[PDB]
Amino acid sequence: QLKLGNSSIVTQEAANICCAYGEWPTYLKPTTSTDRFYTLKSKKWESNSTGWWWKLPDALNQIGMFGQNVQYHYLYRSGFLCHVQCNATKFHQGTLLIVAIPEHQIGKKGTGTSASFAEVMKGAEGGVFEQPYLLDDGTSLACALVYPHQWINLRTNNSATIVLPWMNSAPMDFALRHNNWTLAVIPVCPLAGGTGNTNTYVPITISIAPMCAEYNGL
Amino acid sequence: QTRTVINMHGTAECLVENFLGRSALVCMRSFEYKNQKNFFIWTLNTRELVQIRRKMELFTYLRFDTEITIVPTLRLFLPNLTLQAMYVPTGARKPSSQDSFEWQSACNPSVFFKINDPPARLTIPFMSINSAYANFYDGFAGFEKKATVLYGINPANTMGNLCLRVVNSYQPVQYTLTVRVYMKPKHIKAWAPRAPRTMPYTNILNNNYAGNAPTAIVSHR
Amino acid sequence: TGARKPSSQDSFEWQSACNPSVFFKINDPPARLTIPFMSINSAYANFYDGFAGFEKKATVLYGINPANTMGNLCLR
Amino acid sequence: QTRTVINMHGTAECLVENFLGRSALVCMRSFEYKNQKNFFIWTLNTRELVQIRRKMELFTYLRFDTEITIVPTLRLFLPNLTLQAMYVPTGARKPSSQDSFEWQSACNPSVFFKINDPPARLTIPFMSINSAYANFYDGFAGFEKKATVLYGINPANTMGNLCLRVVNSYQPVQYTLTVRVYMKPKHIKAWAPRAPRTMPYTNILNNNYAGNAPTAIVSHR
Amino acid sequence: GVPTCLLPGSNQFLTTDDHSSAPAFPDFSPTPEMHIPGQVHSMLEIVQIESMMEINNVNDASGVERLRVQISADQLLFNIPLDIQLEGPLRNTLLGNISRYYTHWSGSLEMTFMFCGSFMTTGKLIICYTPPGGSSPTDRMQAMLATHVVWDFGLQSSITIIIPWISGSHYKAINANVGYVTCFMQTNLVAPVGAADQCYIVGMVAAKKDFNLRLMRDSPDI
Amino acid sequence: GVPTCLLPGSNQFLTTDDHSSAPAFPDFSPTPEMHIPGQVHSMLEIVQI
Amino acid sequence: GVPTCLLPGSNQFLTTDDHSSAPAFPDFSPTPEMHIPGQVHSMLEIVQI
Amino acid sequence: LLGNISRYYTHWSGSLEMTFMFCGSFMTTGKLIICYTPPGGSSPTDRMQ
């Protein structure tokens, strides 16, 4: 039962919580009770789904005291603890690949113009892959394992944990229009809980905790 | 169908420094001269040539010092013309024309050479505001919620511009001068390697893929 | 060895970021390169009592070690 | 409308030596040659180019050793003509014409180069009688209460003159030779910084301001 | 003064020379660097990172469907050549993409097969490795003789097979051939009334610390 | 005699190069300097004012 | 800077010169060598046969 | 001096000190509220802000 600040979340950790590139997040004039777990809206993992993605600073611009500080303060610097729970019975099957892409430049298909502020900055709602196979990046899903990756296998491994440090080429950056990380949950193998489709949902639960958070300018 | 018995070697060849860090022909612009314009302007970016663009886009962040080597070439329809290569950093007005006041500056570094001389070199140090070049940027240059501000362009990532002027532009002969630019990174430090790209390119300002098909990379068996 | 040869003078292979090259002019001293010991095999074999391929066909030439190739030089 | 997170640096860039002390194109004189005159005469002063003039006028007193680099340029309507750059110190008669006895002197230093050769350099040491150059002078050159003596000209501040002669002046071809002069101070020591100037210039001999208006510098809100 | 002599190869532009050219900015200090996470010193460190492979690279497979092999209701399941330039399963992998920048390569591999079925479902596969030269197996009897592992879903979720050091080069053009890896249905696929009859297997490949890339060349991918 | 090799970027005029060029006056002594008040070493000292 | 003087016989190609020319591959390692039997150091060893 | 010197430099960063001097009589008295709004925040319009 994990708990940061006031909020708590019940976990099912059974293996070492791997830190992204083995660096535990830390903060180093700038600087405090907003370091708490935010559980995003549950997402339906249908058999015909493609894949979801949340931009963490974008995802937390409007959520509680963290959102209030980001709207008030001109800068930020924050690590992210991402907990993903695919909730299903022993009967269900499939594989979720959780990839924390650094600087995931969204790429439209068969257009000249780039993605606008609307298509990129979903916020708390999160986005959906048009082409999961190409990560909407020109890359391959086969090559997506270079990034901090984990597997939710509906057999054995029913939850994933990612610990993202401050990945940016500046000590601090802006949350309003920059996205250091992109947490992408992609179904590698389609959900096949063949119970006559009594409940095809098998919803995914995302929980983001901004750790070692500091800001500049009150 | 093969005869390969490869003995074990060292890791010298597979260094990032030896991979990214060597000269590559990025710019091959030509200019006619006949009976005011046709000066050389070039934005410093690794995205112009597809091969080096993919090789650089293998990594997220990387620092280097850039050796820019300019090779002149004269193509008459050889006189030893004087060439001036001026490296204008970001935030300085670009030369409006060949006969522009910006050339006669006391702040913009430049080199004077001639055709018969060895090709010119400059080493521009790690120039960006940001503590490392970002090949990809999941943000916006400005704060305006308008199409005027382009997506995925860090304005700190600009390395400045290089402007070459043929001082002896007005000559008795009609010809073409072709400038070759060679870019060589030095002391390369790389962080957060990216997934190698598969599909072709559209433009330097954007990462759109058109399409080895977009639904299948490998030629199906 | 194992790189596509320049198809013509105006070929993309010249504008490569992987093939080493030298730029000189006529009045300049003659150009030099020092290609290190380049073969896969730990020494050049002047004679080879074998075959390049496995096919029992005239397509595969006799007494040619494909590791012995030192590469090609292309002047433009 | 901006993305600026600038990390703390050293004070190397903001040194006075690195500010004033680097090459600047001060003189760009041209000379026709066709079917006795059109020799190059230039007074050594920092006041010819407005940008470097303001940058120098930021300080009252300053000592330096001057690197003068001459870049030749031939413009035919290229033959390797011989150029002689003679540095005549203050108090020596100036070359009356191209074919003048002053060129054949045993006291005036000079350099012999040609067009295809690298551009010529001299380093004239700190040359003034006075122990430092004064950009501003609140006095008179002479004692006469007459308009003949100019106001605010220290006659010790003169660095001497540079005279370039094209030895191969008489040639079968009609052309133009353009001389570029680059001035680079060295070991700069500055004293008593002045208020930065705002308004434009009229002449090198005087500090008159004509007029961003003379009653208001900043464009009014 | 001091004598000097312009050797042949002087006044030439070697495109791979390394010398300290005259600095454009003499006393300028670049922006100080700090600890950016995920430091990499060589591409040999990149190939260490495992990557997913297109085992099901048939024309009927479109998009992510190419990355998973179907298994459901004792026939051959899949075959994979170890050639990393024969536009096989290995082409898309970090191994393939990085190695196609190098003409000469040699080293051992580790292949991880992960099962994507239900918790209740159980079965057996036989995964055999055929060294180079030997014809790829066609029947269980050939598979049961070669260096193989009996992978069980019931006990072990994902299996790892270490392929000993292999080599190949493109260098006339006759290409190259290296050993195969094959999977045969040891038993039926046991699934209760709840779990779906269909199941998927996903492939993963990485290079051990013994891998080496020697001669750098341009990749013909683009 | 001693070998030497003219590297690329030789016989070029870098406008920001720093080298000890041949002295116009070899043994001439500049006018000795004395303590002029108001010494400044950097523009970062000027902005302090 | 440092003076130098181009001696006669400079800018010539001696066909029997021996100097360390600029390496085509700067940090490339050639294939390691092992003990090949029948080492020969001179043709004076060949005539012994 | 800050503006004039800094306009010679593209990249700049550092803290400032602003001195406000009153030019009224000795007898005259009053109060002002001087507020600093960090970057991004809209400039204040009322005493409460």
Author numbering:
A (entry chain B): 15 to 42, 52 to 54, 58 to 244
B (entry chain A), D (entry chain A): 49 to 83, 92 to 133, 143 to 276, 282 to 291
C (entry chain A): 155 to 230
E (entry chain C): 1 to 73, 78 to 175, 183 to 233
F (entry chain C), G (entry chain C): 1 to 49
H (entry chain C): 98 to 146
Quote the study on this structure.
Enterovirus 70 (EV70) is a human pathogen belonging to the family Picornaviridae. EV70 is transmitted by eye secretions and causes acute hemorrhagic conjunctivitis, a serious eye disease. The capsid of EV70 is composed of the subunits VP1, VP2, VP3, and VP4. The major capsid proteins of EV70 are organized with pseudo-T=3 icosahedral symmetry, with VP1 subunits forming pentamers around 5-fold symmetry axes and VP2 and VP3 subunits forming heterohexamers at 3-fold axes of the capsid.
The structures of altered and empty particles of EV70 were determined to resolutions of 3.7 and 4.3 Å, respectively. The altered particle lacks VP4 subunits and is expanded 4% in diameter compared to the native virion. The expansion is enabled by the loosening of contacts between the pentamers of capsid protein protomers, which is accompanied by a reduction in the interpentamer binding interface from 3,350 to 2,750 Å2. The first 48 N-terminal residues and loops BC (residues 84 to 91) and DE (residues 134 to 142) of VP1, loop AB (residues 43 to 57) of VP2, and loops BC (residues 73 to 78) and GH (residues 170 to 172) of VP3 are not resolved in the cryo-EM reconstruction of the altered particle. Amino acid residues 49 to 56 from the N terminus of VP1 cross the capsid of the altered particle of EV70, resulting in the exposure of the N terminus of VP1 at the surface of the altered particle. The N termini of the VP1 subunits pass through the capsid approximately between a 2-fold axis of the altered particle and the canyon. The externalization of the N terminus of VP1 is enabled by a conformational change and a shift of the GH loop of VP3 away from an interprotomer interaction interface. The pocket inside the VP1 subunit in the altered particle of EV70 is collapsed, as is also the case in altered particles of other enteroviruses that were characterized previously. The collapse of the pocket of EV70 is enabled by the movement of VP1 strands B, C, H, and I into the pocket. The altered particle of EV70 contains approximately rectangular pores of 17 by 4 Å positioned on 2-fold symmetry axes of the capsid.
